[PDB]
Amino acid sequence: MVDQATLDKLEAGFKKLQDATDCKSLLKKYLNREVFDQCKSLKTALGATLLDCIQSGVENLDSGVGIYAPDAEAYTLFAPIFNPIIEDYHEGFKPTDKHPPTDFGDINTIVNVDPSGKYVVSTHVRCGRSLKGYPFNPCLTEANYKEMEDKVSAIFGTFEGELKGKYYPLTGMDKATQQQLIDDHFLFKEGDRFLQAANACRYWPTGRGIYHNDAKTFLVWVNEEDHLRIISMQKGGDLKTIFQRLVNAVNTIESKLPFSRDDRLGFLTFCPTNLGTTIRASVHIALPKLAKDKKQLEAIAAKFNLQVRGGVYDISNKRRMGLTEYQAVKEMQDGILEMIKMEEAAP
Ligand code: NA
Structure with a gap:
């Protein structure tokens, strides 16, 4: 259950990443609309949200990576965005690796x-x-x-x-x-x-x-x-x-x-x-x-x-x-x- 205020922040974060034509972060590279919608309404057992993952790359468009993990479960629950970022940064560590x-x-x-x-x-x-x-x-x-x-x-x-x-x-x-x-x-x-x-x-x-x-x-x-x-x-x-x-x-x-x-x-x-x-x-x-x-x-x-x-x-x-x-x-x-x-x- 992700509250509407967070969904509003998530939507504005997504749009801000789209409008940054200059932006080269891995977050921007892989947080397309499909991945965003797969993740935006999920919440981990300890209470972490997609916003708890992506806010720093949203606020800091010059981020190289731009995503962090708010708890252990976030890596699996929000796998649609972590997996392609992980593969790119670690050069070939694929989602099935x-x-x-x-x-x-x-x-x-x-x-x-x-x-x-x-x-x-x-x-x-x-x-x-x-x-x-x-x-x-x-x-x-x-x-x-x-x-x-x-x-x-x-x-x-x-x-x-x-x-x-x-x-x-x-x-x-x-x-x-x-x-x-x-x-x-x-x-x-x-x-x-x-x-x-x-x-x-x-x-x-x-x-x-x-x-x-x-x-x-x-x-x-x-x-x-x-x-x-x-x-x-x-x-x-x-x-x-x-x-x-x-x-x-x-x-x-x-x-x-x-x-x-x-x-x-x-x-x-x-x-x-x-x-x-x-x-x-x-x-x-x-x-x-x-x-x-x-x-x-x-x-x-x-x-x-x-x-x-x-x-x-x-x-x-x-x-x-x-x-x-x-x-x-x-x-x-x-x-x-x-x-x-x-x-x-x-x-
Ligand atoms: Na040191």
Whole structure:
């Protein structure tokens, strides 16, 4: 039962997207009249609406994607619009395609990508998780935010070993605490207009917070965009230790707090760009010789499905869906190994 006020907003949002002749978002590309009418009168069990999916791309016509998920069920219920957007962004993950089961693989096949520290400044592996049972940030209530922070911060306080550390709520955070976290690049702020128009910043900063371990090789953002953004990083290129530290953390959390995961799509996230493995494995790396070639580099990036973002690059795996967590990490590993091999043999 979707109320008339929402239907009126949905109709004006649809028409505004049509009238924007300039607009290149995936939302505009696939929200035709047939899809719109398939979706406009549906509502999820937790109460989410099509407007709770598309408002941010309606308000921000310069959005690249322009759709977000207000809860886990929205991906299936509003599948007529998510499915073509998902296929396009993830380049070939079709509506009938299926994401494999979670598999972190054999960690002993993961290596230090640059033992000498000659090239790789730092390595990062990042994932995201939504907690089963809660709305996503478009639809969390204030009480939801508080209870989740309670549960999650409680779990964080039981981390032992290399994961031992401290939770910092954004609520009541003082300016000195803020600065020390900024200095570490650990702080996040209020979201930009895309997140604002998606209703992902309500009740700010209730339920938002930051966890890191004493060694500062492990970071979690609570309700920055997803319920959890879990990151493992360190200087150099020991991908093995980094990935193993991440999977230990994820497993620990899961043992106390189930994740929202879909058979077809993998782990469900607020942005559909982060589905599947959710995994972004990256290195900060200097390839000066390959920077003077630029033709041999992208031959490797494109061949190993890496995205390349002077001399010092941030290089990360492009694929999130259709491959396992292991294969994503192994793909980054193999690509970086090859590029360093090319760098070492270059002129
Ligand atoms: Na970071």
